[PDB]
Design a protein around this ligand. Structure first.
Ligand SMILES: O=C(O)c1cccnc1
Lengths: 339, 56, 217, 293, 233
């Protein structure tokens, strides 16, 4: 028996799960979506241009008010941008300039940042002293932090470059739940509207669904052939999409446990950095390494819009909860508001 | 090793026990939600500049 | 027109002034990236310098501020975070000369150097080669020949020729020879010498970028 | 005496000869086209190519040359009629001021580019990081203002002097006094020439000291700068030498009684065409040298 | 957070002196400063304002030119120089901090104040409906006010501030912009308005509510105060 029998059993589970996935296969969404009319070409313009940053912008996130957004760039500065009037509400200097992830708390009282440093710093915005100060130093990780997202005013879920994903609480500063299912490096995270399930993609082309409370792998997806660099949640909370360096985007449904479609075009051959969804879910916006940001129809899976307002790699892409505007940031140190 | 393979077994039976639903019905749920709220999605159908807060 | 937003605009102007000052400050400073296999190899030059994630080393030499980033402790796939160091002036790559007799490790260093050299992100960044363990290599030559892991090698076993052979074996992997310039140098026990070589190489690279911007390269 | 004084305020011994129409038309016609094409294409390239301070001086030189090459086709019209001019005083002095200011600005911008290269080679760690674009813009505006001020002396219109009832627009002549315009023609050469020669020598010395790069980059830059310096010297030296001989003859007896001015005037007016040949050559050398073009 | 004022005292007519205020517990550099004086028998009234960058200095119409305000950010202290003082200048002066950004709560902290005494148009006028209203514990009291000009700015926010000054201490901010609660204020407080008619409701009054309530507008540059309504236990 020994490792031979165990490996054969694992292979048998793999075949059984593949056959089960084939069992529910009914029809590709493309044919059923033929009934609904196409969205058509979408003309998009940049209403505001944020030129405060001077280095490459890596990550950004919108607030719950759909007005304030937080930007992270390699120069080691976080800027809170007022979208309506293009004003810098706050400027937070970072001890570690190598920052590639940031998030905005749902209540708008806390922000988080991280990157090549193994510490996920938490900053307070509403300090009575009037200045921004560090609240917690989550330094329990070993690998580089790639994505951190606020789950509540006292709980934050973060993913590191190692094979472990950790859930942290602000009050104590210790790891509550640790997930070790992934084998590669986790790049991006996404929190469902319910705030009970969250997906995670790793470099091994594996997307896994994790439960915040119970803490085990609920779903697995292996439709991609390369690293999952971008991942986001569909607004309804039952579907999610992934972006990879293979120049293709894909949409998965938790209930179906299958890849419903893949978004790609022959001309596009470079990787994908960030992905986001619109309020209605019709529009699937994803950044690309080229000097272009592509908007796809999530249902028909076709190129619906083209944003060529950038001259460098597009890295971050955030969509307001109300869908009033979309902000796209690139490595050109310029952030533009689009709608 | 064996233990982690057994955990894989459990989750797959766990996902197995989840009622893997079929593509249909599932697609109709998305279609119904879109048409039910497409009437008030600014990015799909923008409001006039008078009501739009982002007007120049 | 505005009533209270003028104060916000003024505050934004102060923030912009501070950001511009910090940007000029950072632009004046020069960045260096550390790479190699084996902690002692990198720590040798760090100790030789004269004034947990990445380790930041700041030192002023000849009125120039040097920022050296040690990324050897990350232990993560370089393919997903090497692009962060696109703008670094030079990459200090360290390889121990005495590592050839240890288990194969010289072959691993050669693969690491090949991967770093052929990276698309480092297409216009120079690499500074620091061959550590100079004395240990000379002691090793008298006991073990270089031909154990170098079957193609055929020549006398001496310090000069062995060092030259290792140098030219590390040099050929630079496929894009026209753009990049490899400034190989042997680590010296005497202080105030390696830093001189690093400063000279960085000055040469900066002159090259200046001439590129002029319109001559 | 046929070639007597065309006296307005000084004893101008201007001449009128045959070879001018036989020799000027081809050179000036070819220069007009070649210069306008070569320089306008560079301007269009700049109109869509970044904003870094390095190219501001090059664009200023390009616009200066563009303005320069327009007046020369009129200097032609003057030569075609062999020192006769059809238009009024206002056009004459406006176009001559444009020509002189353009030449001075081109020389000054060439010197500024040479100094910029000297700073960016010999002293990489100096006030050259990016001289924030506003600083370079104000420096360029100050240079334009000072060159305009040193040339407005021409715009104080006297009259379209008539030799035999035909207007001649030459500010250059053999005169009894060394007015400002003669010193400017010498100061525009010795100072910029010395500055550029010193910059090139220092660049060569520093590059050869400890900067060896035989990958067809450093050698290419060295040869390019050497050849541009050589063409500048060849273009500007003959005219200043001719004027030096003219003024040596003027003071050393022979201020009147038609001296070798007979042929020296032709020599000067033929060597002056090299000043516009320099304008023609400047873009093709400076702008096309970079691989971006 | 502490704002301690000092330097007041007795001044002869047409005299001069320098009031000082040392700031601690907060970033003085970021916060702009306001000066408000209260007459022994009258209400509050704004004097001058200095922004964070020491620019856009504003003065009241009745004190323009006569008074001057300065700051020294390294020194972490505020100066208020006055000369040729008049009889009406006798009042208790408070230094008030203020930060200006989206979601801010300006005028959220007031100093203990310094006393000054002297030996023997085109502004916003706020009409106070009442000056004294008896109340009892456990009841509800509503205070109504009127403004000469509508404060509903086109941006959607109204510039209204409510301050409560109990006997023996400086005023305390209750509600700013008639839609937000200041830090440390019990949630029982509430406010509403229609652009011109403003009401302040204090449900479930306790004994600590005894004091005088002052209204403030921040639409126009010249800040003004109301006559003040005093509540009797
Ligand atoms: O270019 C000049 O300065 C000039 C041209 C023609 C005649 N005299 C002078």
């Amino acid at each position: 028996s020994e490792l031979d029998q165990l490996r054969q059993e694992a292979e048998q589970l793999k075949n059984q799960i593949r056959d089960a996935r084939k069992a529910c296969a009914d029809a590709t969404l493309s044919q059923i979506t033929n009934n609904i009319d196409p969205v058509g070409r979408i003309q998009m313009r940049t209403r505001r241009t944020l030129r405060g940053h001077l280095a490459k912008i890596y990550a950004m996130h919108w607030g719950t008010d759909s007005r304030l957004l937080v930007s992270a760039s390699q120069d080691g500065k976080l800027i809170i941008w007022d979208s309506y009037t293009t004003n810098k509400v706050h400027a937070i200097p970072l001890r570690s300039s190598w920052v590639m992830t940031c998030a905005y708390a749902p209540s708008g009282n806390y922000v988080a940042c991280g990157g090549l440093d193994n510490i996920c710093s938490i900053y307070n915005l509403k300090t009575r002293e009037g200045n921004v100060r560090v609240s917690r130093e989550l330094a329990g990780h070993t690998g580089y932090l790639s994505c951190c997202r606020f789950l509540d005013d006292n709980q934050i879920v973060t993913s590191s470059g190692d094979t472990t994903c950790a859930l942290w609480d602000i009050e104590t500063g210790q790891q509550t739940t640790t997930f070790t299912g992934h084998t590669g490096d986790v790049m991006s995270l996404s929190l469902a509207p319910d705030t009970r399930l969250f997906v995670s993609g790793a470099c091994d082309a594996s997307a896994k669904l994790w439960d915040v409370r119970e803490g085990m792998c609920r779903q697995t997806f292996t439709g991609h052939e390369s690293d999952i660099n971008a991942i986001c949640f569909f607004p309804n909370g039952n579907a999610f999409a992934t972006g990879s360096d293979d120049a293709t985007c894909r949409l998965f449904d938790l209930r179906a446990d299958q890849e419903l479609m893949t978004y790609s075009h022959d001309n596009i051959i470079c990787g994908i950095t960030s992905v986001s969804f619109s309020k209605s879910g019709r529009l699937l916006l994803a950044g690309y390494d080229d000097f272009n940001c592509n908007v796809w129809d999530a249902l028909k899976a076709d190129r619906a819009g083209v944003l060529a307002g950038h001259d460098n790699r597009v890295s971050c892409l955030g969509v307001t909860d109300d869908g009033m505007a979309v902000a796209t940031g690139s490595w050109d140190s310029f952030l533009k508001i689009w709608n | 090793s064996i233990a982690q393979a057994r955990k894989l077994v459990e989750q797959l039976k766990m996902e197995a026990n989840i009622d893997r639903i079929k593509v249909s019905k599932a697609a109709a749920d998305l279609m119904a939600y879109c048409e039910a709220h497409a009437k008030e999605d600014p990015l799909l159908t923008p409001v006039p500049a008078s009501e739009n807060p982002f007007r120049e | 027109l505005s009533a209270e937003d003028k104060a916000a605009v003024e505050r934004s102007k102060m923030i912009d002034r501070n950001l511009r000052e910090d940007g000029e400050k950072a632009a004046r400073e020069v960045k260096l990236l550390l790479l190699g296999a084996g902690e002692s190899g990198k720590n040798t030059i760090v100790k030789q310098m004269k004034i947990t994630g990445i380790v930041e080393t700041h030192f002023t030499f000849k009125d120039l501020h040097f920022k050296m980033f040690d990324v050897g402790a990350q232990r993560s796939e370089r393919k997903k975070w090497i692009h962060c160091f696109e703008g670094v002036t030079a990459i200090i790559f360290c390889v121990a000369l005495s590592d050839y007799d240890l288990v194969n490790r010289m072959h691993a260093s050669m693969k690491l150097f090949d991967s770093i050299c052929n990276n698309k992100w480092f297409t216009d960044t120079s690499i500074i080669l620091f061959l550590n363990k100079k004395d240990l290599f000379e002691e090793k030559i008298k006991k073990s020949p270089l031909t154990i892991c170098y079957p193609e090698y055929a020549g006398s076993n001496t310090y000069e020729e062995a060092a030259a052979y290792i140098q030219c074996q590390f040099e050929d992997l630079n496929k894009r020879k026209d753009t990049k310039e490899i400034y190989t140098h042997f680590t010296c026990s005497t202080d105030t010498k390696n830093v001189q070589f690093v400063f000279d190489a960085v000055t040469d690279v900066i002159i090259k970028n200046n001439l590129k911007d002029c319109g001559l390269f | 005496q046929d070639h007597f004084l065309e006296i307005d305020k000084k004893n101008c011994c201007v001449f009128r000869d045959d070879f001018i129409v036989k020799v000027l038309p081809p050179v000036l016609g070819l220069e007009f086209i070649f210069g306008l094409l070569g320089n306008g294409l560079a301007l269009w390239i700049f109109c869509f190519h970044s904003w870094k301070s390095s190219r501001i001086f090059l664009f200023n030189l390009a616009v200066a040359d563009f303005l320069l090459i327009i007046c020369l086709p009129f200097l032609m019209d003057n030569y075609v009629r062999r020192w006769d001019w059809k238009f009024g005083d206002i056009p004459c002095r406006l176009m001559l001021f444009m020509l002189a200011m353009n030449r001075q600005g081109s020389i000054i911008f060439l010197t500024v580019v040479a100094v910029d290269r000297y700073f960016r080679v010999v002293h990489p760690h100096h006030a050259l990081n990016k001289i924030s674009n506003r600083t370079a813009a104000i420096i360029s505006c100050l240079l334009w203002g000072i060159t305009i001020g040193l040339t407005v002396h021409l715009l104080k219109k006297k009259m379209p002097i008539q030799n035999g009832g035909a207007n001649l627009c030459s500010s250059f002549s053999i005169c009894h006094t060394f007015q400002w315009h003669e010193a400017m023609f010498l100061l525009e050469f010795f100072l910029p020439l010395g500055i550029i020669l010193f910059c090139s020598a220092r660049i060569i010395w520093s590059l050869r000291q400890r900067q060896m790069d035989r990958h067809a980059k450093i050698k290419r830059a060295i040869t390019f700068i050497m050849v541009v310096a050589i063409v500048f010297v060849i273009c500007f030296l003959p005219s200043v030498v001719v004027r030096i001989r003219i003024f040596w003859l003027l003071h050393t007896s022979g201020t009147q009684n038609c001296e070798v001015y007979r042929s020296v005037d032709l020599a000067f007016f033929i060597t002056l065409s090299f000043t516009y040949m320099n304008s023609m050559l400047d873009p093709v050398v400076y702008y096309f040298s970079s691989p971006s073009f | 957070v502490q704002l301690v004022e000092s330097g007041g005292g007795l001044v002869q007519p047409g005299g001069s002196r320098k009031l000082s205020c040392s700031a601690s517990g907060f970033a003085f550099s970021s916060f702009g400063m306001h000066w408000v004086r209260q007459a022994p028998e009258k209400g509050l009234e704004w004097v001058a304002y200095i922004s964070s960058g020491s620019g856009t200095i504003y003065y009241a119409d009745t004190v323009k030119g006569r008074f001057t305000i300065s700051r020294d950010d390294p020194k972490n202290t505020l100066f208020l120089q006055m000369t040729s003082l008049r009889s009406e200048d006798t009042a208790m002066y408070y230094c008030v901090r203020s930060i200006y950004y989206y979601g801010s709560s300006p005028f959220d902290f007031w100093g203990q104040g310094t006393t000054l005494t002297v030996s023997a148009s085109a502004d916003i006028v706020m009409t106070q409906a009442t000056s004294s209203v008896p109340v009892t514990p456990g009841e509800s009291v509503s205070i109504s006010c009127r403004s000469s000009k509508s404060l509903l700015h086109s941006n959607g926010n109204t510039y209204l501030y409510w301050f409560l000054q109990r006997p023996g201490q400086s005023p305390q901010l209750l509600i700013y912009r008639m839609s937000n609660l200041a830090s440390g204020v019990p949630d029982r407080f509430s406010g509403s308005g229609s652009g011109t008619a403003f009401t302040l409701t204090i449900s479930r009054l306790e004994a600590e509510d005894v004091g005088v309530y002052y209204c403030m507008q921040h639409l126009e540059y010249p800040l003004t105060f109301g006559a003040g309504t005093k509540l009797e236990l």
